[PDB]
C-alpha cells in the first residue's frame, strides 16, 4: 500500500586496522601437540 | 614437522607439465590415493607379534 520508490547506490563495509606483526616476525613455526602439557628446556653452557 | 609450504602450479601457462600426479581411483571423488596395505596391515603386525613371542 506504498507507492514511494527507492534506489540503493553504494554500501561499504567498515573495518579497523589489524595486522599481526608480532606473530609474523618472530613466531614462525607451529607445533600441534596432542599431549597434556608442554616442556621447554635450557642448558647452561658455561665451560671453564 | 614441516615449517614452510610453497605453492607449485600443476601445469605452466604454456601447457607444459610442471607437476605430475599418478594414482588409480576407485570411487567417484578421490583427492588422494590409498596404499595397497590396508587389507593386510593388521594381520602382518599380528603375525610379527606371534612370531617374536
From Swiss-Prot, chain A:
Part of the intact protein present: 2 to 49 of 341
Compartment(s) where it occurs, according to its Swiss-Prot or TrEMBL record: Virion; Host cytoplasm
Identification of the protein by name: Major capsid protein
Domain of life: Viruses
Family named by the database record: Belongs to the lambda phage major capsid protein family.
Gene behind this protein: E
Subunit structure: Homomultimer. Interacts with FI protein.
Source organism of this protein record: Escherichia phage lambda (Bacteriophage lambda)
Role description: Assembles to form an icosahedral capsid with a T=7 symmetry. The icosahedral capsid is about 60 nm in diameter and composed of 415 major capsid proteins. The assembly is primed by the interaction between capsid assembly protease and portal dodecamer, and major capsid proteins assemble cooperatively to form the procapsid with the help of capsid scaffolding protein. Major capsid protein forms hexons and pentons of the icosahedron. Viral genomic DNA is packaged into the procapsid through the portal vertex.
Swiss-Prot record, chain B:
Signal peptide: none
UniProt PTM: Proteolytically cleaved by the viral protease during capsid maturation.
Transmembrane segments: none
Localization terms from the record: Virion
Function: Forms the portal vertex of the capsid. This portal plays critical roles in head assembly, genome packaging, neck/tail attachment, and genome ejection. The portal protein multimerizes as a single ring-shaped homododecamer arranged around a central channel. Binds to the terminase subunits to form the packaging machine.
Subunit-level organization: Homododecamer. Interacts with the terminase complex composed of two small and one large terminase subunits.
Membership in a protein family: Belongs to the siphoviridae portal protein family.
Protein name: Portal protein B
Organism whose genome encodes this protein: Escherichia phage lambda (Bacteriophage lambda)
Lineage: Viruses, Duplodnaviria, Heunggongvirae, Uroviricota, Caudoviricetes
Gene from which this protein is expressed: B
Residues of the full protein shown: 215 to 267 of 533
Amino acid at each position: 500500500s506504498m507507492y514511494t520508490t527507492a534506489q540503493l547506490l553504494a554500501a561499504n563495509e567498515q573495518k579497523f586496522k589489524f595486522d599481526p606483526l608480532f606473530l609474523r616476525l618472530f613466531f614462525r613455526e607451529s607445533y600441534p601437540f596432542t599431549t597434556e602439557k608442554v616442556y621447554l628446556s635450557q642448558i647452561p653452557g658455561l665451560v671453564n | 614437522m614441516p615449517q614452510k609450504w610453497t605453492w607449485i602450479p600443476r601445469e605452466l601457462p604454456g601447457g607444459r607439465a610442471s607437476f605430475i600426479h599418478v594414482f588409480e581411483p576407485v570411487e567417484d571423488g578421490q583427492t588422494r590415493g590409498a596404499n595397497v596395505f590396508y587389507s593386510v596391515m593388521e594381520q602382518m603386525k599380528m603375525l610379527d607379534t606371534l612370531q617374536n613371542t
